[PDB]
Design a protein around this ligand. Sequence first.
Ligand code: FAD
Ligand code: NAP
Ligand code: NA
Ligand code: NA
Ligand code: NA
Length: 529
Amino acid sequence: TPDLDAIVIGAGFGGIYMLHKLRNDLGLSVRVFEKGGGVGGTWYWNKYPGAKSDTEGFVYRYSFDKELLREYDWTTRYLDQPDVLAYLEHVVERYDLARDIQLNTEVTDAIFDEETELWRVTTAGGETLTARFLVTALGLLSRSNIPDIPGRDSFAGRLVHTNAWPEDLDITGKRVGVIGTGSTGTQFIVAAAKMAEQLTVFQRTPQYCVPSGNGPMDPDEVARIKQNFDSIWDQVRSSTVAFGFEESTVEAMSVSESERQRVFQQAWDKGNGFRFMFGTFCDIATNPEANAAAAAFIRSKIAEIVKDPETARKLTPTDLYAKRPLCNEGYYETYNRDNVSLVSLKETPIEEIVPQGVRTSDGVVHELDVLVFATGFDAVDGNYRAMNLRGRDGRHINEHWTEGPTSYLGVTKAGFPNMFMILGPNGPFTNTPPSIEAQVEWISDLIDKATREGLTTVEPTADAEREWTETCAEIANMTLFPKADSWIFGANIPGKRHAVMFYLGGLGNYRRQLADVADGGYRGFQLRG
Ligand SMILES: Cc1cc2nc3c(=O)[nH]c(=O)nc-3n(C[C@H](O)[C@H](O)[C@H](O)COP(=O)(O)OP(=O)(O)OC[C@H]3O[C@@H](n4cnc5c(N)ncnc54)[C@H](O)[C@@H]3O)c2cc1C
Ligand SMILES: NC(=O)c1ccc[n+]([C@@H]2O[C@H](COP(=O)([O-])OP(=O)(O)OC[C@H]3O[C@@H](n4cnc5c(N)ncnc54)[C@H](OP(=O)(O)O)[C@@H]3O)[C@@H](O)[C@H]2O)c1
Ligand code: NA
Ligand code: NA
Ligand code: NA
C-alpha cells in the first residue's frame, strides 16, 4: 500500500492540470512537489522586466473548462508574466489545489521498487514517501544554463540568470549588461533599455526577430473571441503549431515575387513569430528556397529599421531561419537608442568577467552594476538527468539516454513502469498549453484504466520506444530544424549530445498518435495485473 496513489513533480501549467485530473476527476490521493516558493513554473521564476507570452493571450491558457474560458478576462494581446502567474494562481484557487501542492520542496531521488511495484520519492529536506504512479512535469525549459565564463564568480554587482530574476532588483538608472539574444534576452532588452542608464548587449548569435503586434485588447474583441472559443480550440487542436491562426497551405515558390513580398509584409504587420514562419507559406521550415525568401525579408527590415550600418550588420543573421521563431515589440528599434550598445561576441568574445564588469578580447572593460544571463536552459532532459531517477534493475535514467533522451509518445519510458512525463523528450513542439492538455488527459485515462482493471504496472516496451525514436528522427530530418544550432537539438550546452528531442509532426498528428495507441489496446505497453 503506497503513501499516495500518485506523486506529481512540478507546479507549472503541467503539474497543476495533472493534479486536478488525478485528484478532482479520478479521486486519487495525490501530492505535487515544487522546488519553487510559489506555483506557476516558468511564470513564477521569470520575473524579469519584459517577460511575456509569445503565443497571443487568447490561446495561452487552458481550454478544458468552458466556464473558465467564459469568465477569465485578459487586457493585452500578449500576456505579461504577472498576468500569466495570476491566471495560474486563479486556476489553483478555482480547483482547491494549493492544499496538495508542497512548495520549496525539490525532489532529489525517485526510485522504482520492483518487489513492491511502488515509486519512492526523496526530498532535499530528507523526507521519503511512496506512490503507485509518478508524473514528472519538470519543464522543457526549467533547468537554468549559466555558462562557465572565466572570472564569472568575481563580479561584485548583481549577477542573475533571467530564470532567477529577483523581485527586489530595480535596474532603473543602472549600467546593465545582458548575455544572450533568444526570446528571453530580446524581450528583456526591449524593456531594460527603457529603464537602464546604459544597456550593453553581448550577442554571440543574432536571430531573425519579427514584430509581436502587441498592444491593448478591445474588450468587445475579447467578448467576440469568447463567443467563438469552441471553433478556436477545435482549429488549435487540429493545427500543427496550435497558435490560433490558420496555417498556410501555399508553397512559397508557387506564387510570384510580388505575392511573396505581400504575404510576408501582411504577416509582419499583423505580428507573431509562428505566424511569420507558418502563417505565410507551408514550407518555410522545409524548403531551403522558401527559407531563403523568408530570411531575406527579415534582413531587409533590419536594414530599414537600424540607423547605424555597423549595428544593422551585427544584428543581421546569415544562417537558416530555423531556430524557434522570435517576436517582440520594437526590438530592432531599441538599437537606435543612445543608451544601448551591441557587442558581437563573434568579433570581440568575452575574455574575463571582473569585479566591475566584463572585459572583451579588444581589452574594453564594460563597466556594469548588473550582469544578466539570458543564456537559456539545459532543455528537455536537464531536470531528469539531475535527479537520482532509477528504474528496473536500479539503472539511472542516464544509462538509458547515452545517445540522447528518449520516450514512448513523449509521455512514457521503457524501464520506468508507472512513470508518466508531461513534455518528456520526443513530444510535440507547439503552443504549450494544448500539448500539455493532450498529454495530461491521455495519462489520466491510462492511470484510470490501471485503477479500474487492478493493474500493478503500465510500461512501454524497449521496441516501442525505439520505433518512436525512429518516427521522430524521420520527421525531424524532413525539416531544416536540425540545421539550426539551438537548445532544440541540445547543441547549446558544451558536451551535450546533439539529438532529436521533439516530435515535429504537430499537435493534430500528435493527438492522433495518442488516440490511435489508446484505441488499439495501448499498442507498445505491457499491462500487468
Ligand atoms: C518568459 C517565457 C515566456 C514563454 N512564453 C511562451 C509562450 O507564449 N508560448 C509557449 O508555447 N511557450 C512559452 N514559454 C515556454 C514555457 O515553458 C511553457 O509555455 C510552459 O509554461 C511550461 O510549463 P510546464 O509546466 O511544462 O513547465 P515549467 O513551467 O517549467 O514548470 C516545471 C516546474 O517543475 C519544477 N521542478 C523541476 N524539477 C523539480 C524537482 N526535481 N523537484 C521539484 N520541482 C521541480 C520547476 O521548479 C518548475 O517550476 C515561455 C517561457 C518563458 C520563460
Ligand atoms: N516571449 C516569450 O514567449 C519567450 C520568452 C522567454 C523564452 N521563450 C521560450 O524559452 C526558450 C529559450 O529562450 P531563451 O532566450 O531563454 O534561451 P535560448 O533561446 O537558448 O537563448 C540563449 C542565448 O544565450 C546565448 N548564449 C548561450 N551560451 C552562451 C555563452 N556561453 N556565451 C555567450 N552567449 C551564450 C545564446 O547564443 P547562441 O545562439 O550562440 O547559443 C543565445 O543567444 C525560447 O526558445 C522559447 O521557447 C519565449
Ligand atoms: Na499573482
Ligand atoms: Na552597460
Ligand atoms: Na535548434
